[PDB]
């Protein structure tokens, strides 16, 4: 669904780094690796957390029984 | 132990043994009676003579 | 069907398909085995109890 | 048979606890 709060392995907050990661890939045009480094993710456990995140919430939200069309 | 079984506390509070009250075990059973059926080691019931 | 390849280095597609054959062959035998020791033991125990 | 292509410009991305990527 949404970006998890804290890394499953150690507990380093990862939830504030999702939207910032896409901005480093889009606007900054950086590679996956360097973008994660600039966010402050050096442990491979914290690295995979954001890198491997799907974000199905954006797909899920497109079905809204409260708004017409 | 290799001769033991790990019993969940769920089973321990339901499975009871009819222990006859005597002078040698009056102390042990009095506590069980006070503890009741939800506190282990307790007692669910008491059978009169 | 002689596989020169190992699981560390990997197995070629021809070897893979042949390994799939031999691997399944055992599971097929476990599906076609009507013989059971249930009734055989039940007949002995009732006469020897 | 063509070999599996290696990844371009692979650098060190793991160091000691209190040591950053200051060493080049």
């Amino acid at each position: 669904m949404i970006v998890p709060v804290r890394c499953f392995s150690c507990g380093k907050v990862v939830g504030d780094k999702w939207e910032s990661y896409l901005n480093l890939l889009q606007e900054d045009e950086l590679d996956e690796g360097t973008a994660l480094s600039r966010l402050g993710l050096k442990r491979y456990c914290c690295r995979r957390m954001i890198l491997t995140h799907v974000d199905l919430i954006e797909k899920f939200l497109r079905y809204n029984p409260l708004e017409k069309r | 132990e290799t001769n033991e079984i790990g019993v969940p506390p769920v089973f321990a509070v339901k499975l009871t043994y009819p222990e006859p009250v005597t002078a040698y075990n009056i102390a042990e059973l009095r506590q069980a009676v006070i503890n009741g059926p939800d506190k282990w080691p307790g007692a669910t019931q008491i059978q009169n003579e | 069907g002689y596989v020169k390849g190992r699981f560390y280095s990997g197995i070629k597609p021809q070897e893979y398909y042949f390994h799939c054959m031999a691997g399944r062959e055992g599971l097929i035998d476990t599906a076609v085995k009507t013989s059971r020791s249930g009734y055989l033991q039940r007949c002995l125990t009732k006469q020897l109890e | 048979r063509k070999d599996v292509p290696k990844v371009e410009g692979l650098k060190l991305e793991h160091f000691a606890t209190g040591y950053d990527a200051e060493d080049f």
Binding site: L22, L51, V54, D55, L56, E58, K59 | - | - | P5
Partner: protein
């Protein structure tokens, strides 16, 4: 240089469901014997 995962491409498609030809034609090619079979019940030559 690698056989990478589409991250930017994925998230954009999640927000924007295509209005043209659907992505992943192989997924529609998987149900091709089912849909095609029922399609031939009315459509095609000889009615």
């Amino acid at each position: 240089r690698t056989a990478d995962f589409r991250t930017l491409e994925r998230e954009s498609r999640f927000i924007n469901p295509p209005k043209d030809k659907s992505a992943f034609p192989l997924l529609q090619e998987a149900v091709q014997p089912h849909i095609g079979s029922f399609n031939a019940l009315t459509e095609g030559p000889d009615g």
